[PDB]
PDB file of C-alpha atoms and ligand atoms in Angstrom:
ATOM      1  CA  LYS A  99      17.218  28.797  29.960  1.00  9.71           C
ATOM      2  CA  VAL A 100      20.276  29.921  30.609  1.00 10.86           C
ATOM      3  CA  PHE A 101      21.526  29.849  34.432  1.00 10.79           C
ATOM      4  CA  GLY A 102      22.673  32.685  37.016  1.00 13.83           C
ATOM      5  CA  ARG A 103      25.541  31.223  38.219  1.00 10.47           C
ATOM      6  CA  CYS A 104      24.079  30.790  42.002  1.00  8.81           C
ATOM      7  CA  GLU A 105      20.336  30.320  40.589  1.00  7.12           C
ATOM      8  CA  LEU A 106      22.505  26.992  39.310  1.00  8.10           C
ATOM      9  CA  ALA A 107      24.160  25.975  42.321  1.00  7.23           C
ATOM     10  CA  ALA A 108      21.140  26.667  44.489  1.00  3.12           C
ATOM     11  CA  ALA A 109      18.775  24.253  41.738  1.00  2.00           C
ATOM     12  CA  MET A 110      21.366  21.604  41.994  1.00  2.00           C
ATOM     13  CA  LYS A 111      21.539  21.650  45.395  1.00  2.00           C
ATOM     14  CA  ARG A 112      17.718  21.209  45.986  1.00  2.00           C
ATOM     15  CA  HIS A 113      18.626  17.907  43.522  1.00  2.00           C
ATOM     16  CA  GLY A 114      21.271  17.169  45.654  1.00  2.00           C
ATOM     17  CA  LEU A 115      23.873  17.094  44.143  1.00  2.00           C
ATOM     18  CA  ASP A 116      26.515  19.403  46.373  1.00  2.00           C
ATOM     19  CA  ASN A 117      28.918  16.246  47.785  1.00  2.00           C
ATOM     20  CA  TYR A 118      26.800  13.703  45.778  1.00  2.00           C
ATOM     21  CA  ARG A 119      29.639  10.735  45.486  1.00  2.00           C
ATOM     22  CA  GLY A 120      32.055  13.670  47.290  1.00  2.00           C
ATOM     23  CA  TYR A 121      31.688  16.324  44.416  1.00  2.00           C
ATOM     24  CA  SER A 122      31.452  19.586  46.239  1.00  2.00           C
ATOM     25  CA  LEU A 123      28.648  22.054  44.728  1.00  2.00           C
ATOM     26  CA  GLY A 124      31.824  24.292  43.424  1.00  2.00           C
ATOM     27  CA  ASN A 125      32.599  21.179  40.211  1.00  2.00           C
ATOM     28  CA  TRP A 126      29.320  20.742  39.388  1.00  4.67           C
ATOM     29  CA  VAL A 127      28.301  24.549  39.547  1.00  7.17           C
ATOM     30  CA  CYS A 128      32.596  24.484  37.376  1.00  7.10           C
ATOM     31  CA  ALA A 129      31.723  21.899  34.831  1.00  6.96           C
ATOM     32  CA  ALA A 130      28.305  23.172  33.446  1.00  4.94           C
ATOM     33  CA  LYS A 131      29.725  26.344  32.763  1.00  2.82           C
ATOM     34  CA  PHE A 132      32.740  25.213  30.906  1.00  3.97           C
ATOM     35  CA  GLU A 133      30.691  22.438  29.173  1.00  6.30           C
ATOM     36  CA  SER A 134      27.180  24.929  28.492  1.00  8.61           C
ATOM     37  CA  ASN A 135      28.042  28.288  29.737  1.00 12.17           C
ATOM     38  CA  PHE A 136      25.116  27.205  31.249  1.00  8.88           C
ATOM     39  CA  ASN A 137      23.013  27.670  28.884  1.00 10.91           C
ATOM     40  CA  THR A 138      20.217  24.612  28.874  1.00  9.50           C
ATOM     41  CA  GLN A 139      20.042  23.726  25.128  1.00  9.31           C
ATOM     42  CA  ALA A 140      23.753  23.704  24.691  1.00 13.35           C
ATOM     43  CA  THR A 141      24.758  20.660  22.032  1.00 13.25           C
ATOM     44  CA  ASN A 142      27.572  20.124  20.378  1.00 10.77           C
ATOM     45  CA  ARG A 143      28.217  17.167  17.362  1.00 10.04           C
ATOM     46  CA  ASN A 144      30.886  14.676  17.665  1.00 10.65           C
ATOM     47  CA  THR A 145      33.137  13.456  15.082  1.00  8.90           C
ATOM     48  CA  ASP A 146      31.309  10.145  15.548  1.00 11.32           C
ATOM     49  CA  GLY A 147      27.864  10.785  14.895  1.00 11.76           C
ATOM     50  CA  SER A 148      26.651  11.343  18.618  1.00  8.80           C
ATOM     51  CA  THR A 149      25.730  15.166  19.895  1.00  8.27           C
ATOM     52  CA  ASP A 150      26.226  15.814  23.274  1.00 10.70           C
ATOM     53  CA  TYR A 151      23.204  17.653  25.089  1.00 12.12           C
ATOM     54  CA  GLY A 152      21.537  20.423  27.732  1.00 13.37           C
ATOM     55  CA  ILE A 153      23.632  21.787  30.432  1.00 11.76           C
ATOM     56  CA  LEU A 154      26.243  18.873  31.325  1.00 11.12           C
ATOM     57  CA  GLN A 155      26.396  18.018  28.174  1.00 10.93           C
ATOM     58  CA  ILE A 156      25.772  14.607  28.494  1.00 12.64           C
ATOM     59  CA  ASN A 157      26.747  11.795  25.141  1.00 13.78           C
ATOM     60  CA  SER A 158      23.665  10.707  23.074  1.00 18.23           C
ATOM     61  CA  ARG A 159      27.011   7.184  22.738  1.00 18.39           C
ATOM     62  CA  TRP A 160      25.838   6.453  25.794  1.00 20.39           C
ATOM     63  CA  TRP A 161      23.123   7.935  27.711  1.00 22.75           C
ATOM     64  CA  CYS A 162      20.560   9.170  26.110  1.00 21.43           C
ATOM     65  CA  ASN A 163      18.430   8.512  22.349  1.00 21.24           C
ATOM     66  CA  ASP A 164      18.471  10.666  19.880  1.00 19.11           C
ATOM     67  CA  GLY A 165      17.326   8.285  16.872  1.00 17.51           C
ATOM     68  CA  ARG A 166      20.385   9.506  15.413  1.00 16.73           C
ATOM     69  CA  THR A 167      23.419   7.810  16.891  1.00 17.46           C
ATOM     70  CA  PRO A 168      23.076   4.320  15.537  1.00 18.07           C
ATOM     71  CA  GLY A 169      24.249   1.127  17.506  1.00 15.02           C
ATOM     72  CA  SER A 170      24.622   3.845  20.816  1.00 14.14           C
ATOM     73  CA  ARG A 171      22.782   2.885  24.243  1.00 12.77           C
ATOM     74  CA  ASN A 172      19.768   4.903  26.365  1.00 14.87           C
ATOM     75  CA  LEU A 173      21.566   4.423  29.935  1.00 17.09           C
ATOM     76  CA  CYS A 174      19.289   6.903  31.002  1.00 17.89           C
ATOM     77  CA  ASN A 175      16.133   5.412  29.609  1.00 17.67           C
ATOM     78  CA  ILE A 176      15.726   9.369  27.893  1.00 14.85           C
ATOM     79  CA  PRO A 177      14.837  11.097  24.629  1.00 11.71           C
ATOM     80  CA  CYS A 178      17.866  12.851  24.495  1.00 12.24           C
ATOM     81  CA  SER A 179      15.756  16.415  24.030  1.00 15.02           C
ATOM     82  CA  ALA A 180      14.769  15.362  27.064  1.00 13.23           C
ATOM     83  CA  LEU A 181      17.937  17.361  28.729  1.00 11.60           C
ATOM     84  CA  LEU A 182      17.285  20.857  27.257  1.00 12.91           C
ATOM     85  CA  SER A 183      14.285  21.427  29.378  1.00 11.99           C
ATOM     86  CA  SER A 184      14.674  24.899  31.542  1.00 10.16           C
ATOM     87  CA  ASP A 185      14.589  22.419  34.618  1.00 12.10           C
ATOM     88  CA  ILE A 186      17.375  20.252  35.365  1.00 13.53           C
ATOM     89  CA  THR A 187      15.603  17.434  36.711  1.00 12.64           C
ATOM     90  CA  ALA A 188      16.318  15.078  33.706  1.00 10.72           C
ATOM     91  CA  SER A 189      20.105  16.438  33.267  1.00 10.24           C
ATOM     92  CA  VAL A 190      20.836  15.849  36.919  1.00  8.11           C
ATOM     93  CA  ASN A 191      19.187  12.079  37.016  1.00  7.15           C
ATOM     94  CA  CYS A 192      21.664  11.799  34.636  1.00  5.41           C
ATOM     95  CA  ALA A 193      24.771  12.987  36.076  1.00  6.24           C
ATOM     96  CA  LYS A 194      23.988  11.442  39.098  1.00  4.69           C
ATOM     97  CA  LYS A 195      24.038   7.819  37.608  1.00  6.10           C
ATOM     98  CA  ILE A 196      27.116   8.895  34.824  1.00  8.20           C
ATOM     99  CA  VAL A 197      28.994  10.048  37.805  1.00  6.21           C
ATOM    100  CA  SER A 198      28.760   6.501  39.728  1.00  2.00           C
ATOM    101  CA  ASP A 199      29.677   4.684  36.415  1.00  2.40           C
ATOM    102  CA  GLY A 200      33.827   3.898  37.639  1.00  2.00           C
ATOM    103  CA  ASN A 201      35.070   7.412  36.268  1.00  2.00           C
ATOM    104  CA  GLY A 202      34.524   9.911  38.504  1.00  2.00           C
ATOM    105  CA  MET A 203      34.215  13.391  37.631  1.00  2.00           C
ATOM    106  CA  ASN A 204      36.395  12.499  34.969  1.00  2.00           C
ATOM    107  CA  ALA A 205      33.530  12.051  32.223  1.00  2.00           C
ATOM    108  CA  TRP A 206      33.097  15.521  31.508  1.00  2.00           C
ATOM    109  CA  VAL A 207      36.512  16.562  29.641  1.00  2.00           C
ATOM    110  CA  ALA A 208      35.499  20.190  30.743  1.00  3.14           C
ATOM    111  CA  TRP A 209      35.899  19.703  34.560  1.00  2.00           C
ATOM    112  CA  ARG A 210      38.717  17.158  34.141  1.00  2.00           C
ATOM    113  CA  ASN A 211      40.587  20.215  32.204  1.00  2.00           C
ATOM    114  CA  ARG A 212      39.324  23.226  33.342  1.00  2.00           C
ATOM    115  CA  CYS A 213      37.940  22.823  37.327  1.00  2.00           C
ATOM    116  CA  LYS A 214      39.756  19.764  38.776  1.00  6.94           C
ATOM    117  CA  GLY A 215      42.236  20.856  40.915  1.00  5.58           C
ATOM    118  CA  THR A 216      41.287  24.397  40.840  1.00  4.70           C
ATOM    119  CA  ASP A 217      39.547  26.753  44.016  1.00  2.00           C
ATOM    120  CA  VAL A 218      36.090  25.138  42.874  1.00  2.35           C
ATOM    121  CA  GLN A 219      34.331  26.543  46.526  1.00  2.00           C
ATOM    122  CA  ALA A 220      34.819  29.674  43.975  1.00  2.00           C
ATOM    123  CA  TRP A 221      31.904  29.378  41.359  1.00  2.00           C
ATOM    124  CA  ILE A 222      29.550  28.794  44.396  1.00  2.26           C
ATOM    125  CA  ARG A 223      30.894  32.576  47.133  1.00  2.00           C
ATOM    126  CA  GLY A 224      28.474  34.971  47.730  1.00  2.03           C
ATOM    127  CA  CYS A 225      25.333  32.550  46.821  1.00  2.15           C
ATOM    128  CA  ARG A 226      22.676  32.349  49.891  1.00  2.00           C
ATOM    129  CA  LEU A 227      22.805  28.738  49.936  1.00  2.49           C
TER     130      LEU A 227
HETATM  131 CL1  LIG B1152      35.661   9.890  42.609  1.00  2.44          CL
HETATM  132 NA1  LIG B1153      21.766   6.630  22.118  1.00  2.00          NA
END
């Protein structure tokens, strides 16, 4: 499913991401935009053999099991395919564990290079929340 900007903001808010660990909603919407262009089915292979899945491009090296990433961890205890669902619950629950890992949203390269330090509130402006 390809989410609308405000549609995703509303969904993330309903799942408790707004201000989660100090990160305002705009941060999460911005990260999703540049990581997957709001597409829940997005996948991207990395040089190390791992793969990134879903709306927030969660990596199989540490967070989910895709059966083809040797010696990897499944910290979120979930098959990576579950992160491609139209229902973002799985991606949100796993993202909460990731952002609490100690490095905050810096775990998402796109957020660090394209959202961090910018006016992220602009991503939820005009939305009925
Ligand atoms: Cl932080
Ligand atoms: Na894994």
